[PDB]
Design a protein around this ligand. Structure first.
Ligand SMILES: *[C@@H]1O[C@H](CO)[C@@H](O[C@@H]2O[C@H](CO)[C@@H](O[C@@H]3O[C@H](CO)[C@@H](O)[C@H](O)[C@@H]3O)[C@H](O)[C@H]2NC(C)=O)[C@H](O)[C@H]1NC(C)=O
Ligand SMILES: *[C@@H]1O[C@H](CO)[C@@H](O)[C@H](O)[C@H]1NC(C)=O
Ligand SMILES: *[C@@H]1O[C@H](CO)[C@@H](O)[C@H](O)[C@H]1NC(C)=O
Ligand SMILES: *[C@@H]1O[C@H](CO)[C@@H](O)[C@H](O)[C@H]1NC(C)=O
Ligand SMILES: *[C@@H]1O[C@H](CO)[C@@H](O)[C@H](O)[C@H]1NC(C)=O
Lengths: 270, 25, 247, 48
């Protein structure tokens, strides 16, 4: 049985995220002293981050671009810092380098989008306010602030090449936790559809099946249930604290009853 | 068989059937 | 120095619901039938900076509210950020900053706990929670955030922890990013508590049809517990069973 | 015996076998085709 509709259910949040608060920030915290800005209880179109002016690097490692719309996260962490042009590649899972091993290392299983753009018109002097560590005996733990002298100041100059040019880099750390999600983006929560094989997409909980009324006695902090086979069976709606059963769309085998072709060609299907 | 039950089993058959123990997508 | 743990110190491992299921999981609990360090901060005063290690158990019953908060940190000085929690009758204060403590921090009933507040990062305020009601709190450091559980129930034995099972419910999930290595209980000066430690252990969690954890089994407690864990059941029939291997 | 065999077959569905995740949709929506092909190959080999 093919899906017949496409349901969308996101919490009662309509305010725009302070995306420009950290994306359009006047000052970015140094890469070795990067700030972690937590964004929550808001909805914002990630396309404006995809197609913002003067943007050169918008890659989602562990996410698919334009798929963030249908995915709501409990909390989104905005890590704002400025690095060299050649150092943007180091802000990614599995990458090694000066920034990736001295100042700011992402987890090897990073689930987020690394956003960078050239800022030679704003962060160029040598701009001796941005600093990056240059020496360390080992590699940094993921999301750690570490504070010749290892802490070497950036030589950010307008005459410097695009490799040495200052680039403002923002990291969106998405945490898909079992708690209800709030950073939902541009999603018009559709009507709750019952007795129809529909695609769930409950705050990004991708799936398909039949949604009916549920009688489980959920605890207040629990958002969804599970079966003995570790299969999702019930989901609580983010807006109203109502739980709904999940039944997969019916299927089966098809067999044909036929007599000998030498007699006739009438068939029956079961 | 006893002609007084929905299933025309015997007493022994009923006992044997009762003495046995009691996803998919 | 009462020495027992009985069967207390088990929380809900995750917010996932499940009913009528026998689930096994690996997480940091307090080992069953261990013994805990009975304490008396003020008898003479002592507030040692106990190490955090992997996790810390805590419980107490009182009415005068002598216990008012905790002091977490790595270096426990102003050089690096340190965590502070204060429980007052109005609200709850969370202040994770580079705090400079004095010789004897206390809540004057003034702020003599610290000399200056600087480089403040995380602050949070909510409803307050803090001689028979036990108030257990599990302090954990997982994935760069801070976690605390809670449970309130009356018990008529204050010097020794009783038997029985009471699962702990999750309260907060604070993405602070602070590294915690040592901690110390904070008290108000115008006093008995306990301190355990969490170790990686496998547990057999029984879930009620209402979704409540009513029973637990410590897998490595004894061979009978290993047999129960192997069979995924609470009753074992007559026979001989292979459980593990010996080297 | 039949029930236990079916239970083992069902439970085997949640193994990584070395891949990033045991959920097909996450791998599809998190990776580019060149690596997703390898991950899917590994997963289907295990399931087979
Ligand atoms: C576990 O779930 C079962 C349901 O299968 C609970 O049994 C039923 O629980 C409800 C509410 O807890 C009881 O309703 C109450 O009954 C009292 C009886 O005097 C009435 O005064 C209240 O106004 C309310 O209607 C219901 O009676 C009870 N059923 C039976 C047969 O006892 C069970 O309580 C749950 N366990 C826990 C620990 O929550
Ligand atoms: C905000 O962003 C827009 C386009 O990205 C830019 O034109 C404008 O100057 C920015 N405002 C600031 C940085 O204050
Ligand atoms: C019980 O207490 C003794 C000290 O009397 C200590 O050596 C031992 O480690 C304790 N056992 C546990 C399981 O904590
Ligand atoms: C009382 O609680 C509040 C929490 O809002 C805290 O800020 C304050 O320091 C506490 N003590 C006094 C004397 O107000
Ligand atoms: C916390 O301190 C420990 C010291 O043992 C250090 O290894 C770790 O990198 C520190 N983490 C942060 C985030 O500062």
């Amino acid at each position: 049985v093919q899906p017949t509709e496409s349901i969308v259910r996101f919490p009662n949040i309509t305010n725009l995220c302070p995306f420009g608060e950290v994306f359009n920030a006047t000052r970015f915290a140094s890469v070795y002293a990067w700030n972690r800005k937590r964004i929550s209880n808001c909805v914002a179109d990630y396309s404006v981050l995809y197609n913002s002016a003067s943007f050169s690097t918008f890659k989602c490692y562990g996410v698919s671009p334009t798929k963030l719309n249908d995915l709501c996260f409990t909390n989104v962490y905005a890590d704002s810092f400025v690095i060299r042009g050649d150092e943007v590649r180091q802000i990614a899972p599995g990458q090694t380098g000066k920034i990736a091993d001295y100042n700011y290392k992402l987890p090897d299983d990073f689930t987020g989008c690394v956003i960078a753009w050239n800022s030679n018109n704003l962060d160029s002097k040598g701009n001796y306010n941005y600093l990056y560590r240059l020496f360390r005996k080992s590699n940094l733990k993921p999301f750690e602030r570490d504070i010749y002298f290892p802490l070497q100041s950036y030589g950010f100059q307008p005459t410097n090449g695009v490799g040495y040019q200052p680039y403002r880099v923002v990291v969106l750390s998405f945490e898909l936790l079992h708690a209800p999600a709030t950073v939902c983006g541009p999603k018009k929560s559709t009507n709750l559809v019952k007795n129809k094989c529909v695609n769930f997409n409950f705050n990004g909980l991708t799936g398909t099946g039949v949604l009916t009324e549920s009688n489980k006695k959920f605890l207040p902090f629990q958002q969804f249930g599970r079966d003995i086979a570790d299969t999702t069976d019930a989901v609580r709606d983010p807006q109203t604290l109502e739980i709904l059963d999940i039944t997969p769309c019916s299927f089966g085998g098809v067999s044909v009853i036929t007599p000998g072709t030498n007699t006739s060609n009438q068939v029956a299907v079961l | 068989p006893d002609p007084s039950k929905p299933s025309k089993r015997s007493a022994i058959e009923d006992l044997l059937f009762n003495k046995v123990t009691l996803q998919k997508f | 120095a009462y020495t027992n743990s009985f069967t207390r110190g088990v929380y809900y491992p995750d917010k996932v619901f499940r009913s009528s299921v026998l689930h096994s999981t690996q997480d940091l609990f307090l080992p069953f039938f261990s013994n805990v360090t009975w304490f008396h901060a003020i008898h003479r005063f002592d507030n040692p900076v106990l190490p955090f290690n992997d996790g810390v158990y805590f419980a107490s019953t009182e009415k005068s509210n002598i216990i008012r908060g905790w002091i977490f940190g790595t270096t426990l000085d102003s050089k690096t950020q340190s965590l502070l929690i204060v429980n007052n009758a109005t609200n709850v204060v969370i202040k994770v900053c580079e705090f400079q403590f004095c010789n004897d921090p206390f809540l004057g009933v003034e702020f003599r706990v610290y000399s200056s507040a600087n480089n403040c990062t995380f602050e949070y305020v909510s409803q307050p929670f803090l001689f028979k009601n036990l108030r257990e709190f599990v302090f954990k450091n997982i994935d760069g955030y801070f976690k605390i559980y809670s449970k309130h129930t009356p018990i008529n034995l204050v010097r020794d922890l009783p038997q029985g099972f009471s699962a702990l419910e999750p309260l907060v999930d604070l993405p602070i990013g602070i590294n915690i290595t040592r901690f110390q209980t904070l008290l108000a000066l115008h006093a008995a508590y306990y301190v355990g430690y969490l170790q990686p252990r496998t547990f057999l969690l029984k879930y009620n049809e209402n979704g409540t954890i009513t029973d637990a089994v410590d897998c490595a407690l004894d061979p009978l517990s290993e047999t129960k864990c192997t069979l995924k059941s609470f009753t074992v029939e007559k026979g001989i069973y292979q459980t593990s291997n010996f080297r | 015996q039949n029930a236990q065999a079916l239970n083992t077959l069902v439970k085997q569905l949640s193994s990584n076998f070395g891949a990033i995740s045991s959920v097909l949709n996450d791998i599809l929506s998190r990776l580019d085709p060149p690596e997703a092909e390898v991950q899917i190959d590994r997963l289907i080999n295990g399931r087979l």
